Ligand binder design. Structure first.
Ligand SMILES: [Mg+2]
Ligand SMILES: [Mg+2]
Ligand SMILES: [Mg+2]
Ligand SMILES: [Zn+2]
Lengths: 196, 205, 52, 190, 153
RNA sequence: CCAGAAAAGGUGUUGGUUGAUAUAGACAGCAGGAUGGUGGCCAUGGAAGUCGGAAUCCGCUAAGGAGUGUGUAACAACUCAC
């Protein structure tokens, strides 16, 4: 049950700080479960990424402060959905792999937009049967060669706007979605030292 | 067909059973009294819930079967088709009478047998269900929705007895391990320290 | 003929309600007990039947 | 159970000058003054702190049916502070399937004539409340803006013109027309 | 030009119900030329549900079989295949054993939709009681064997 | 006595019994995930978690049911357990 789950989590965070003296305090903000499964399974030989209740990691580290007092610098740097990357491999190669493994996620029907979604004026591959998904946004379309030609560029979703459920579907069926979410690393712990 | 059951409700008359003197009694329509996986051992249905009456009244033999079907139909949905045992523990014996009018009047008044009814004392187990100890709320809800078929007032009490036995649950497996009572189906047999000694030898052999 | 966020604005006031089984009254969507004393603040509610 | 004491302080901001005449409060600031007598509510309103920074409502020996009226008083004082600092802008949009709802504003924000609702020829003349200024907003095609100080006047003058536009004897689930309250914000922001 | 399409065909018998035309016609080529070749190219599957990728170019598509973990195990259970008369309840008893289960786990491994092979044999032994099979005792018999008596790589 | 009411209910309110979970940070509430084998096997014209019958595992996990509900011809899209 949940009590022995917490007590096992204490053990599997005690031994993962007794093993690796080198850590990343990385923000797992709004990444997918499979988009973390890809990175976790890909770096399995070369990293161990860990998450959990931050108010549980506070007391899990304070149960080690009996032994290693250099872990106190981790405590003010656990706020928000932030977790651990444990390794004995590198200092910047797996950093660049964290930077390079981030995947452009699909446009959620209600997520905030970080960047200026627009569509280039082009001939898509949808076909004439699927014009009503452009008519819901008011895109002036033309049928050529059995597909749909978007005549002009459309600024449909701008930076810092709500992504509508109607205007999120045509991004999915045009198979372009600029929302690349990944790991947003901000605090490094390496042998009792912190760098940005 | 039959008159409303608010008429034949209180235990007014003497108990007047189907006998040599009262003949021609029409049969009470409850005839299956216990069901479920009634072919089971005592070890595998420990838990038991009783619908206990709290009025001295008469429950009709039709209401008994209605409540039995309502308590069965819930647990074939809930506990699977062989995860319980309902035993209705009120067989109806009191036949009730009817003076029907067609003009003679009240003269020569003694009723024909109409139906059979069960006279229920204060604090008496009407129905009882045994099942696993994990199906506790299923017994509670099944007896609750079977309460609405009876008139009057019933409470729901989950007993301390191992199933349909008269022995307590905290002592049942102890006494089985001590070989003081042996299983024979729905119930157990209690062995005293009083028999001839070959019956002691035959169970310790 | 109508735009979808406007029809959702209209139907949160017209459609998206609860309706009580007894007394037939109209309640807010997160309702558990009826408002009317005429039904005894009863507990059995239903949603409003959506249009087809 | 009578509890012995319930209280809840309300931080009034810097620009608001609040005073209280016995139990009747007066909140003054940029946009005007609001007065609302609580002479039904049977509490202790005390304006503690010099610089006069907090209002404090006390209830002594109250069961829960009258302890419920403490954050009620606090929320009326907070909506009384908000409508004098920031104001109350209720925007409300006219949803129409076929016939356009033609709203014209008369008596410089105090009367709303609603025309052509479902093609009907009866015109809805709805008077506003004293302190509320209706307007047809620019940069949005059919949106009414109700601005004022008292939230119980702004919202009631919204609900009047919303209940003036109802269907009769038809399926309300399909004839989804009328003016409906869309956004409940402040007039100026912070 | 280079494209890819998918279709979930039915094994050995050519499906008369054309699920081929509405995805091949607007791409240009004949669908009846291709959809009969899918079924003979599968061939040995012969009874089951089989997903098939087809990379399609300006000249022709290419027919190769996508493996499924529940389909590779039931082609390995080799029961006498019923014809199109389609009777009841073909529920899959029988005995498969551990070596060819590991060999199917090889293909789920090099699919690269997997963990290491000691985990893949567990998550594919779960498919044995999914289909309903019996390695003289299914994954409840195989809970504590792979715990400390594994035959893994 | 005796001159009128019941089964059934109530998030009205007041007591009372019993069991839970909660600073290893709960209940709400607002936000982020809600994955893979897999569109699990039977079946069905079509059932991809969501009409049906039995199963109900594993892996990755901080975590996610061979799925609580709304949906679909079937998906999709949303929602819930966690
Ligand atoms: Mg009558
Ligand atoms: Mg008598
Ligand atoms: Mg009509
Ligand atoms: Zn009601």
């Amino acid at each position: 049950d949940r009590a022995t789950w917490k007590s096992n989590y204490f053990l599997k965070i005690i031994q993962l700080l007794d093993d690796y003296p080198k850590c990343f305090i990385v923000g797992a903000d709004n990444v997918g479960s499979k988009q973390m499964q890809q990175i976790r399974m890909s770096l399995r030989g070369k990293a161990v990424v860990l998450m959990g209740k931050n108010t549980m990691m506070r007391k899990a580290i304070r149960g080690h402060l009996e032994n290693n007092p250099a872990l106190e610098k981790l405590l003010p740097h656990i706020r928000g959905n932030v977790g651990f990357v444990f390794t004995k491999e590198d200092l910047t190669e797996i950093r660049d792999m964290l930077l390079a493994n981030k995947v452009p996620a699909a446009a959620r029907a209600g997520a905030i937009a970080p960047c200026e979604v627009t569509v280039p004026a082009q001939n898509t591959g949808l076909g004439p049967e699927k014009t009503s998904f452009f008519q819901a946004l008011g895109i002036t379309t033309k049928i050529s060669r059995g597909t749909i030609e978007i005549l002009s560029d459309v600024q449909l979703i701008k930076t810092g706007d709500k992504v509508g459920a109607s205007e999120a579907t045509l991004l999915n069926m045009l198979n372009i979605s600029p929302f690349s979410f990944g790991l947003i690393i901000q605090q490094v712990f390496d042998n009792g030292s912190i760098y940005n | 067909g039959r008159r409303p059951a608010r008429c034949y409700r209180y235990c007014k008359n003497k108990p007047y059973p189907k006998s040599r003197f009262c003949r021609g009694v029409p049969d009470a329509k409850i005839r299956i009294f216990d069901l479920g996986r009634k072919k089971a051992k005592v070890d595998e249905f420990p838990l038991c819930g009783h619908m206990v009456s709290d009025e001295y009244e008469q429950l009709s033999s039709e209401a008994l079967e209605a409540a039995r079907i309502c308590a069965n139909k819930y647990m074939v949905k809930s506990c699977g088709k062989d995860g319980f045992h309902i035993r209705v523990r009120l067989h109806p014996f009191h036949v009730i009478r009817i003076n029907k009018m067609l003009q003679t009047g009240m003269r020569g008044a003694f009723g024909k047998p109409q139906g059979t009814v069960a006279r229920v004392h204060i604090g008496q187990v009407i129905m009882s269900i045994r099942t696993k100890l994990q199906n506790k709320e299923h017994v509670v809800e099944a007896l609750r929705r079977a309460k609405f078929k009876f008139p009057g007032r019933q409470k729901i009490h989950i007993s301390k007895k191992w199933g349909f036995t008269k022995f307590n649950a905290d002592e049942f497996e102890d006494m089985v391990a001590e070989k003081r009572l042996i299983p024979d189906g729905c119930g157990v047999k209690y062995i005293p320290n009083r028999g001839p000694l070959d019956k002691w030898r035959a169970l310790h052999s | 003929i109508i735009e979808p966020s406007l029809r959702q604005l209209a139907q949160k006031y017209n459609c998206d309600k609860m309706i009580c089984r007894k007394c037939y009254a109209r309640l807010h969507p997160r309702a558990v007990n009826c408002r009317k004393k005429k039904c005894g603040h009863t507990n059995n509610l239903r949603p409003k039947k959506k249009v087809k | 159970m009578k509890t012995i004491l319930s209280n809840q302080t309300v931080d009034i901001p810097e620009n608001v000058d609040i005073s209280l005449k016995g139990r009747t409060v007066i909140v003054k600031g940029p946009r005007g003054t609001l007065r609302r007598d609580f002479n039904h509510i049977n509490v202790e309103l005390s304006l503690l702190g010099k610089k006069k920074k907090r209002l404090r409502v006390d209830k002594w020996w109250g069961n829960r049916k009258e302890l419920a009226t403490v954050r009620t008083i606090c929320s009326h004082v907070q909506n009384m502070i908000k409508g004098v600092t920031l104001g109350f802008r209720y925007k409300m949009r006219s949803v129409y399937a076929h016939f356009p709802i033609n709203v014209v504003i008369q008596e410089n924000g105090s009367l709303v004539e609603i025309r052509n609702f479902l093609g009907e020829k009866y015109i809805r003349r709805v008077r506003m409340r004293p302190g509320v200024a209706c307007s047809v907003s620019q940069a949005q095609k059919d949106e009414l803006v109700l601005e004022g100080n008292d939230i119980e006047l702004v919202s009631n003058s919204a609900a009047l013109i919303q209940q003036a536009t109802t269907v009769k004897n038809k399926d309300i689930r399909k004839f989804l027309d009328g003016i409906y309250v869309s956004e409940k914000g402040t007039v100026q922001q912070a | 030009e280079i494209k890819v399409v998918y279709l979930r065909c039915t094994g050995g018998e050519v499906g008369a119900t054309s699920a081929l035309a509405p995805k091949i016609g607007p791409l240009g080529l004949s669908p009846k030329k291709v959809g009969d070749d899918i079924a003979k190219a599968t061939g040995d599957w012969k009874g089951l549900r089989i997903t098939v990728k087809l990379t399609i170019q300006n000249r022709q598509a290419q027919i190769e079989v996508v493996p499924s973990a529940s389909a590779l195990i039931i082609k390995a259970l080799k029961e006498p295949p019923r014809d199109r008369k389609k009777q009841k309840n073909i529920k899959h008893s029988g005995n498969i054993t551990f070596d060819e289960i590991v060999n199917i786990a090889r293909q789920m491994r090099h699919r690269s939709l997997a963990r290491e092979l000691s985990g893949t044999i567990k998550e594919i032994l779960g498919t044995a009681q999914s289909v309903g099979c019996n390695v003289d005792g299914r994954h409840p018999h195989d809970i504590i064997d792979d715990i400390n008596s594994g035959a893994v790589e």
